């Protein structure tokens, strides 16, 4: 599944709902800390719609548990990420992923 650990608290009040657009900064890392992706490197917040399944399952369910302003560490099992196949060249098979996610606003 996905484990959500707070880095810095949000408002504790505004949680994203299905159909809402979520605006975040994130960094994605393998288990050894190797970064494979980061919106912060692009200096461009990333937007996705909750429930569209345009992000991995661990994000769908993990970010849904975050409040606006919150920064959290999401630890995501492979079945909630890229599974047995992984993404060859980037993500190994059966990889646990760690994401640093900051929820900036809802749209």
Numbering used by the authors: 1 to 107
What do the authors report?
Since these hydrogen exchange measurements utilize mildly basic conditions for extended time periods, we substituted valine for Cys22 of wild-type FKBP12 to circumvent the chemical modifications that can occur at cysteine residues under such conditions. We found that substitution of valine at position 87 dramatically suppresses the minor state of the slow exchange transition. Given the 12% population of the minor state in wild-type FKBP12, the H87V substitution shifts the equilibrium of the slow exchange transition at least 60-fold or by more than 10 kJ/mol. To gain further structural insight into how the H87V substitution so dramatically alters the dynamical properties of the protein, we carried out a crystallographic analysis of this variant protein at 1.70 Å resolution (crystallographic summary). Beyond the changes in covalent structure caused by substitution of valine for histidine at residue 87, there is strikingly little alteration within this region of the protein. The Cγ1 atom of Val87 lies upon the histidine Cγ atom of the wild-type structure, while the valine Cγ2 projects toward the face of the aromatic ring of Tyr82 which is not displaced but appears to become more constrained. Of the nine aromatic phenylalanine, tyrosine and tryptophan residues in FKBP12, the ring atoms of Tyr82 have the highest average crystallographic B-factor in the wild-type structure, but the lowest average B-factor in the H87V structure. This rigidification of the Tyr82 side-chain mobility is consistent with the reduced conformational dynamics of the Tyr82 backbone that is indicated by the marked narrowing of the amide resonance of this residue in the H87V NMR spectra. The H87V mutation appears to lock the protein in a conformation closely similar to the major form of wild-type FKBP12. The peptidylprolyl isomerase activity of FKBP12 is unaffected by the substitution of valine at position 87.
The immunophilin FKBP12 (FK506-binding protein of 12 kDa) was first characterized for its role in binding the immunosuppressants FK506 and rapamycin. The FK506-bound FKBP12 forms a ternary complex with calcineurin that inhibits the protein phosphatase activity of that enzyme which, in turn, blocks a key T-cell activation pathway involved in tissue transplant rejection. In complex with rapamycin, FKBP12 binds to and inhibits the protein kinase mTOR (mammalian target of rapamycin). Biochemical isolation of the RyR (ryanodine receptor) Ca2+ channels from skeletal muscle demonstrated that four molecules of FKBP12 are bound to each tetrameric RyR1 receptor.
